[PDB]
UniProtKB/Swiss-Prot annotation, chain B:
It is an enzyme of class 7 (translocase). It catalyses: ATP + H2O + 4 H(+)(in) = ADP + phosphate + 5 H(+)(out). GO terms for biological process: proton motive force-driven plasma membrane ATP synthesis. Belongs to the ATPase alpha/beta chains family. PANTHER family: H(+)-TRANSPORTING TWO-SECTOR ATPASE, V-TYPE PROTON ATPASE CATALYTIC SUBUNIT A. GO terms for molecular function: ATP binding; proton-transporting ATP synthase activity, rotational mechanism; proton-transporting ATPase activity, rotational mechanism. This is V-type ATP synthase alpha chain. GO terms for cellular component: proton-transporting ATP synthase complex. The gene is atpA. NCBIfam families: PRK04192.1.
Swiss-Prot record, chain C:
This is V-type ATP synthase subunit D. It comes from the Bacteria. Produces ATP from ADP in the presence of a proton gradient across the membrane. Belongs to the V-ATPase D subunit family.
Swiss-Prot record, chain D:
GO terms for molecular function: ATP binding; proton-transporting ATP synthase activity, rotational mechanism; proton-transporting ATPase activity, rotational mechanism. GO terms for biological process: proton motive force-driven plasma membrane ATP synthesis. The keyword Ion transport applies. Produces ATP from ADP in the presence of a proton gradient across the membrane. Belongs to the V-ATPase E subunit family. One of its GO terms (cellular component) is proton-transporting two-sector ATPase complex, catalytic domain. It comes from the Bacteria. This is V-type ATP synthase subunit E. It comes from Thermus thermophilus (strain ATCC 27634 / DSM 579 / HB8). Keywords: ATP synthesis, Hydrogen ion transport, Ion transport, Transport.
Curated annotation (Swiss-Prot), chain F:
One of its GO terms (biological process) is proton motive force-driven plasma membrane ATP synthesis. It comes from the Bacteria. Belongs to the ATPase alpha/beta chains family. This is V-type ATP synthase beta chain. The gene is atpB. GO terms for molecular function: ATP binding; proton-transporting ATP synthase activity, rotational mechanism. InterPro entries: ATP-synt_VA_C, ATPase_a/bsu_AS, ATPase_F1/V1/A1_a/bsu_N, ATPase_F1/V1/A1_a/bsu_nucl-bd, P-loop_NTPase, V-ATPase_su_B/beta. Produces ATP from ADP in the presence of a proton gradient across the membrane. The V-type beta chain is a regulatory subunit. It holds the Pfam family ATP-synt_ab. It comes from Thermus thermophilus (strain ATCC 27634 / DSM 579 / HB8).
Length: 470, 578, 41, 127, 40, 468, 193
């Protein structure tokens, strides 16, 4: 259409173009060289004197004589449609599955607008993840933000894939229920390696989870702007589905640490003084723009639920990324290196994990009437068991009271049967059954956090129901 | 009106040309969309504008028009029962006109311009008027809303419209000079409203909660701070304060809170009942609501808008309770703004002027004599929620340097089912000495000494914990066991308060004084008994302890009887007991 | 425990001071470069 | 107790302030009465001369039209321009060469600038 | 007692009157001084 | 008497503004900034060159523009009109009245920065001020002409201690020998952004004691501008120096919340982009604080004196913070407050061990109170240090494992805190304080007092704790 | 200039047991005395001025309290020299630049004191030079470098701070003067970290 050839400066990721006052701030531009190669770029600063283009990828062949710049779009936009389900994209939306491109019902800006706080509604319905340590003890409610705090080499990717394959809604547990409640999973992988990309492709294709999922996979050698755009496109698709087709969307963002490092790199690229520990002073705002895009809206039957996964840089919960994420989100599921290296999978430590919105999404008409008290009793029993397990190393077993030994055995069985479920998929009923079987190992009377009606109804099962087939 | 053209766009920062005459910190409209921004710098023929909303799609050459006035709030009828943003944008109307998303450049008026109000004039032609005087009156729910002359207006009245139904925009008093006085006037948010004289913290702010009203009182016009641990019941305590306090109006400011926490606030307050009238409490409340994904400027201006509204209702002659939730989030917004302006950070990235701004916010509170000669007050209760709970954080340290009371909500107490979950070993009030005369005149002449005795008992029982932990309560001797058990009685019968009970939700000072006097009399008689040789296991079986257990739940109109009766039975029990 | 707390506080203060100094140096150098560009391009 | 002497002290101070303000009022009246009397052209010429001397270089001399005929002598002799303006009476105002500095020699402003220093002498004279 | 405060009130009124009367004598000379000091 | 206006404003940003053709604006000159509205606000020239002059505004810059704004020259040096009639007045922190009375008639106009006192013109502070607080009078004696700040915390009662010192401080000429008649203190009270609560406390106390008739109050409140916070102590000390060394007054200067002064200083320095110090505070903070503190003292050949009691709140209760550290290197000691003693209910909560008075030895002894003062103070310090050490030990190993000597030292420490430090609001004579000190020392063996000469031990050892 | 530099072999008796016994300083040596406020730097320096075995004592008050210079002026005339038997002040030279005096003058004060000490050394004396606080000299350097718009090293100080301190401290030593006599300069410098 129109080409700008007045290029006057190339350095690092930036390119200055003269007489480009027609370019809008934030526009996307194609950059062409003598060889005919076309690169992408974003307008990051427009002035009467010149415009500054941040070039995706590298500038290994550009020259001032032959390079030209052209306009692609005034605003970064994504063409969305319900045919995205079953597709894999690359963080800017270009398909990477080999299938033809989608025909967009509409084209939607990816920097979505804030939700009006008077339009929101209180989360009150849960989504079953299939993992007992979440469903029973750290329940995940629709419209909730519950990140997974992982470490350097813990299996967070496997847990993400399992939650993607197993996540479901349970209308049958909510009164009369509804004939149908559509469900979809959006999967944003930021800064992953070829190994992880292959693993995700295979996991989604070997169980039919692709048919209900949309994958936005950003590799580690792909441009950083793509990394920053990936979560925004994922959430744009999620909001579209949820609030225009009544889907229940679950969004899994694979590595928020990679996103924040990308943000830092680009902030330095735009000549900005870094804030605390090197991160932009506006990192809180960006992370809120990403996270706060989930919720339940009044008068809409859909919902957007978010599980941001981040690796804590040095097992430090005080690092800016985990700190701000916790300061904006509604709990944390924390993975344990001790459980991981003892062979337990999935290695979720119940003690440091929390789900703030759990108490709303558990009870009569959602799950079961005994959920909350069973969870509290499980927490207290496991804590006592761990303490006694450390005391026995000094005092020995013969010097413990019988109740203490029962707590010890309970801790062992809890680790072996509740936390260690493998690739099984457990309904809330099965998880509660296992919880009551484990609680039966303690005398009826140390169960001080559960009412007598529930105890009489459920106490007394045998652990052989799961011990016979872990 | 000053008009220019965009010269440079780089993020939220826009440079405009042809802006000679533009004033510092004025509000400007940028681009065709009319996005609102603030002039933060002037250089030659240029003005630096920081745009509240996102600037994507803007182009060089687009127009920039300056409004000529700083950030201001419309003050007048129609603010009660309203839900606003950090810059006074009515959210219900934005939803009505735009959907479930907030779009760029949505212009909507704070006060509804179509509602009519019943106007009763209180001035006649030829009367002189000065800033703050009452031109007339309008009924707003249960409130005799006074229409005030703006603080910077004087003159002689010429026309006073008769009684009738009028819209806020309609001129209602025209001065001889020609100035037209409407039902509302605009006031800057960063300029404290004028007053004749600030008074002293001589009188109390009765929250209705025994622990706060007795051990850690806050004076009318004072400032308090609460930390927001998760699971400490902060929201319930704040709601009880709103319901049962002696404030005539409540302003609640959420300045960056989580999305679902704000959903909880906006879904729960409409379901709160005003005890004084039985109708909704929102008829007596203004809510400023901001989430973390809303513009940074809105989050920074939230508290200033709230305090300006509180000061307005104060000038009308009311007592207003302002409850700023998560001033830490406001500090985060201030930090981001300072970073974008390329300022030198101090301490944890916060701007060097954080303490000054926080002080200027907290010290607009105070009991006042208004420009109209009436008396009003604004009491502020700000919440500090550091991300990790560390009290060395700059925001908490700066707040504790300026506030007069600190109520330490603790999750450990809530885990023990003790509500309100306020810790009496980290909390403090700096108002008790100034409030002593009021107590001596209004509740009882010996009330301060009784409160001091209760504090001393709690301190003693804290000292004995290191012994009770190693060896159970049964091992302690009779005197120490009496101390432990009088502490238990205090905690369970005077410091605990069920916010969901019909009668116990509110306690008057007389009720608290009676309960304290009963407990201390029981302790005196029990010490006498122990010195006489009565085993403590016998003391704990007395039904008088059961009568003290139920004192909380006796009604205010019934408590006096119950009280002298129970005192008589306290004297009877130990005299009769061998 | 008080000793470990004191050590933690000391190290935090040292690291924050070093970060502040680095930021101040970067800002001063950037300002000098901008002045040079304005004066001589 | 003797704390009632504050009433005497405040009364004395308030009376002294009223007396000084009355003295200022009479001074202002006398100033505004000066131009009507024939001795005004010379004082205004001296004011304009001092204003010019305060500028290293003056672009123009500004005074009310009623003073322009009296100031023309200095204006032309000094070589500076002149322009009419409803400016402050009782004095003349100068404009710098670049047009961004301005020196005013109005007596109604000199009184304001000299009152703070002269108050002590006036009070000593009065009492 | 209030008698002392009333006495002090009378004394203050007398002092103010005395100051005003003393000032009334020399006011014109003060005006002359100010005019001499303000004129060029 | 000519008003020169400059209309060449080029750049307004934050608290600074630049004026072009202002070669005739002296460095440090006070200007007047007038807007289109006619509002008049002030500033100071902080850098002047042939290109432009840099002006920092004492209040916010809202409402300033480059078309209708003008700056005029007020004075070449910042000055303050002074008189003997300032006593009984209240001011804004710039100098203007707030009490409704007419402005002052200046006898002189003195520069607010003052001038350094020649070290040859001073005399050595000698006279002893009896504060009525034993922890200060016996262990940290305050001598007239001394700067002895109070190091306080976030919620500790330092304002109460300052008010009590103001109410009770005396000179005791009978002990010094002359037996001269009483010479009451004049009080210059400077506020640096205080709440209404502390101001109300101070005003009520001064009214109760009738001090306002001999006091000058400079009040900068939390709602007042932060830049003006820098001028307030300079105005207060200019008035104090005028009174002391021109009218033979004895002025006690109370500067409250010097931490607010340092915060304002840091804000201005950050705006100007100066090389910082240790926590972002300007590199010249030591010199700026010296220019305020050093203005106290006594001058040879004059009868007046200026003595200062700054109050600063240690942030997070750490001495190593820049504000307490730099104050410590300047001031002649410090009275530190203890949060532990406050939590135990001890008033005034003054912990002797971190507190010191450098000029103590020049105001106590024969003819300067009593001859046993210094040795009693030293012995008390040694005994209290031992008691604190054994209290630390007991928290680990318990009481039964103690020797009789250690037990006596613990009992002495507890009795010290209960009877010497804790005195409430009672005004104690130096003799009463020394009697209590000797009664506490009597709890120890007569041979453990290595700091007291045998003669004094014979003279005073023996009394029991029975003071009434 | 000097003719030769000699190896210190005699003590600089300060009159204080701890310093004279456990941590001696020779007559050509150097010593630093850092400490926090309230630790007793000034009393130690004044004691060194009062009791040291030096022929001449040069005291430099760089940016320290003025009362401490008034104390010397008022007390020393009434005290006796340890050796000569006359007034102590007769062997003392004071260079005073207090904390509220001009900041730039602290550097000049250090240099003036050291030059006077070197002069009295050239006459054949043993001179003791006491620097009341070198930290204030560092602060003056930092302020001037701030005005020069120079890049700072650690804690804002100019990178040439160590060089200045070295040039200052290396003017001490027992020397054979150009006149063939023997003299020395001991520097005891106080740091205020």
């Amino acid at each position: 259409k129109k080409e700008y050839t007045g290029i006057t400066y190339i350095s690092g990721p930036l390119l200055f173009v003269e007489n480009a006052k027609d370019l809008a701030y934030g526009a996307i531009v194609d950059i062409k060289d003598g060889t005919g190669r076309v690169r992408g770029g974003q307008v990051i600063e427009v002035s009467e004197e010149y415009a500054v283009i941040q070039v995706f990828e590298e500038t290994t062949g550009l020259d001032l004589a032959t390079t030209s710049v052209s306009l692609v779009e005034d605003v970064a936009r994504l063409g969305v449609s319900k045919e995205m389900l079953g597709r894999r994209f690359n963080g800017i939306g270009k398909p990477i599955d080999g299938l033809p491109p989608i025909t967009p019902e509409k084209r939607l800006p990816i920097t979505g607008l804030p939700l009006n706080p008077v339009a929101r509604r209180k989360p009150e319905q849960f989504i079953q993840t299939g993992i007992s340590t979440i469903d029973v003890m750290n329940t995940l409610v629709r419209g909730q933000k519950l990140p997974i705090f992982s470490g350097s080499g813990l299996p967070a990717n496997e847990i993400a894939a399992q939650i993607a394959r197993q996540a479901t809604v349970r209308p049958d547990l909510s009164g009369e229920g509804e004939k149908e409640e559509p469900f979809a999973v959006v999967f944003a992988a930021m800064g992953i390696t070829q190994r992880e990309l292959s693993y995700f492709i295979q996991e989604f294709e070997r169980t039919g989870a692709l048919s209900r999922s949309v994958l936005f996979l950003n590799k580690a050698d792909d441009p950083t702007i793509e990394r920053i755009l990936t979560p925004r496109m994922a959430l744009t698709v999620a909001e579209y589905l949820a609030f225009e087709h009544d889907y229940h969307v679950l969004v899994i963002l694979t590595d928020m640490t990679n996103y924040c490092e990308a943000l830092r790199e680009i902030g330095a690229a735009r000549e900005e003084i870094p804030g605390r520990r090197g991160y932009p002073g506006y990192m809180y705002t960006d992370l809120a723009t990403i996270y706060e895009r989930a919720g339940v809206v009044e008068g809409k039957k859909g919902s957007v639920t978010q599980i941001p996964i981040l690796s804590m840089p040095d097992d430090d919960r005080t690092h800016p990324i985990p700190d701000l994420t916790g300061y904006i989100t509604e709990g944390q599921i924390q993975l344990s290196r001790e459980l991981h290296r003892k062979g337990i999978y999935p290695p979720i430590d119940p003690l440091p994990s929390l789900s703030r919105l759990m108490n709303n999404g558990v009870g009569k008409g959602k799950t079961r009437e005994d959920h909350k008290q069973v969870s509290d009793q499980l927490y207290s029993a496991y804590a006592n068991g761990v303490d006694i397990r450390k005391l026995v190393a000094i005092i020995g077993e013969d010097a413990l009271t019988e109740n203490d030994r029962r707590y010890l055995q309970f801790a062992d069985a809890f680790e072996r049967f509740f936390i260690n479920q493998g690739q099984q998929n457990r309904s809330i009923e099965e998880s509660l059954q296992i919880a009551w079987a484990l609680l039966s190992m303690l005398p009826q009377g140390e169960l001080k956090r559960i009412s007598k009606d529930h105890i009489g109804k459920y106490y007394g099962q045998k652990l052989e129901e799961i011990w016979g087939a872990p | 009106m000053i008009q220019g053209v965009i010269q440079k766009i780089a993020g939220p920062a826009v440079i405009a040309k042809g802006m000679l005459g533009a004033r510092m910190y004025d509000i400007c409209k940028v681009g065709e969309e009319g996005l609102v921004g603030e002039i933060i710098r002037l250089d030659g023929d240029t003005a630096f504008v920081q745009v509240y909303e996102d600037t994507s799609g803007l182009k060089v050459g687009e127009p920039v028009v300056s409004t000529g006035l700083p950030l201001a709030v419309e003050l007048g009828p129609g603010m009660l029962n309203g839900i606003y943003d950090g810059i006074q944008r009515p959210l219900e109307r934005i939803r009505e006109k735009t959907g479930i998303y907030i779009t760029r450049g949505v212009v909507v008026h704070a006060l509804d311009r179509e509602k009519k109000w019943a106007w009763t004039p209180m001035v006649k032609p030829g009367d002189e008027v000065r800033g703050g005087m009452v031109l007339g009156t309008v009924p707003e729910f249960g409130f005799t809303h006074k229409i005030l002359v703006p603080p910077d207006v004087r003159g002689r009245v010429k026309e006073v419209k008769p009684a009738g139904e009028y819209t806020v925009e309609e001129p209602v008093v025209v001065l001889e000079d020609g100035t037209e006085l409407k039902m509302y006037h605009t006031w800057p948010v960063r300029r404290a409203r004028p007053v004749q004289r600030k008074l002293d913290p001589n009188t109390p702010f009765l929250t209705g909660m025994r622990i706060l009203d007795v051990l850690f009182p806050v004076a009318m016009g004072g400032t308090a701070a609460i930390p927001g641990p998760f699971g400490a019941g902060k929201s319930v305590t704040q709601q009880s304060l709103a319901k049962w306090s002696n404030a005539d109006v409540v302003v609640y400011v959420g300045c960056g809170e989580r999305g679902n926490e704000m959903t909880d606030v906006l879904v729960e307050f409409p379901e709160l009942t005003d005890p004084k009238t039985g109708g909704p409490l929102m008829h007596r409340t203004v809510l400023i609501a901001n989430t973390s994904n809303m513009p940074v400027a809105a989050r920074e201006a939230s508290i200033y808008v709230g305090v300006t509204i509180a000061e307005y209702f104060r000038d009308q002659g009311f007592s207003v309770a302002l409850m700023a939730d998560s001033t830490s989030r406001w500090a985060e917004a201030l930090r981001e703004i300072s970073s974008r302006l390329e300022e030198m950070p101090a301490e944890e990235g916060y701007p060097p002027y954080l303490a000054a701004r926080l002080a200027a916010f907290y010290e607009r509170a105070g009991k006042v004599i208004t420009l109209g000669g009436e008396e009003g007050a604004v009491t502020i209760v700000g919440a500090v929620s550091p991300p990790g709970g560390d009290m060395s954080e700059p925001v908490t340290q700066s707040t504790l340097r300026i506030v007069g009371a600190f109520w330490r909500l603790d999750a450990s107490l809530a885990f023990r089912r003790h509500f309100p979950a306020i810790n009496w070993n980290g909390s403090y009030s700096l108002f008790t000495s100034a409030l002593d005369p009021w107590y001596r005149e209004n509740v009882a002449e010996d009330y301060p000494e009784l409160r001091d005795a209760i504090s001393e008992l709690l301190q003693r029982e804290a000292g004995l914990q290191e012994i009770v932990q190693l060896v159970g309560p049964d091992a302690l001797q009779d005197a120490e066991r009496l101390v432990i058990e009088v502490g238990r009685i205090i905690r369970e019968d005077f410091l605990q308060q069920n916010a969901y009970h019909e009668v116990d939700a509110y306690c008057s000072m007389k009720k608290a004084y009676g309960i304290m006097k009963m407990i201390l009399a029981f302790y005196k008689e029990a010490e006498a008994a122990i010195k006489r040789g009565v085993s403590i296991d016998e003391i704990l079986q007395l039904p008088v302890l059961e009568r003290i257990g139920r004192a909380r739940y006796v009604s205010e109109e019934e408590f006096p009887a119950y009280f002298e009766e129970a005192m008589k039975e306290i004297q009877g029990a130990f005299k009769a007991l061998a | 425990i008080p000793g470990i707390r004191a050590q933690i506080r000391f190290i935090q203060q040292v690291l924050e001071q070093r970060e502040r100094e680095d930021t101040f140096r970067l800002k001063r150098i950037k300002g000098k470069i901008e002045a040079r560009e304005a004066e001589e391009e | 107790e003797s704390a009632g002497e504050l009433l005497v002290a405040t009364a004395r101070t308030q009376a002294r302030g009223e007396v000084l303000e009355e003295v200022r009022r009479r001074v202002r009246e006398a100033l505004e009465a000066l131009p009507q009397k024939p001795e005004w052209p010379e004082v205004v010429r001296k004011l304009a001369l001092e204003a010019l001397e305060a500028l290293p270089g003056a672009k123009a001399l500004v005074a009310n039209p009623e003073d322009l005929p009296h100031l023309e002598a200095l204006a032309r002799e000094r070589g500076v321009e002149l322009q009419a303006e409803p400016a402050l009476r009782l004095g003349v105002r100068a404009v710098g060469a670049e047009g961004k500095t301005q020196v005013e020699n109005s007596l109604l402003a000199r009184l304001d600038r000299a009152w703070d220093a002269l108050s002590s002498k006036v009070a000593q004279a009065l009492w | 007692t209030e008698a002392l405060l009333a006495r002090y009130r009378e004394r203050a009124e007398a002092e103010a009157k005395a100051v005003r009367e003393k000032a009334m004598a020399r006011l014109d000379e003060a005006v002359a001084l100010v005019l001499k000091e303000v004129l060029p």
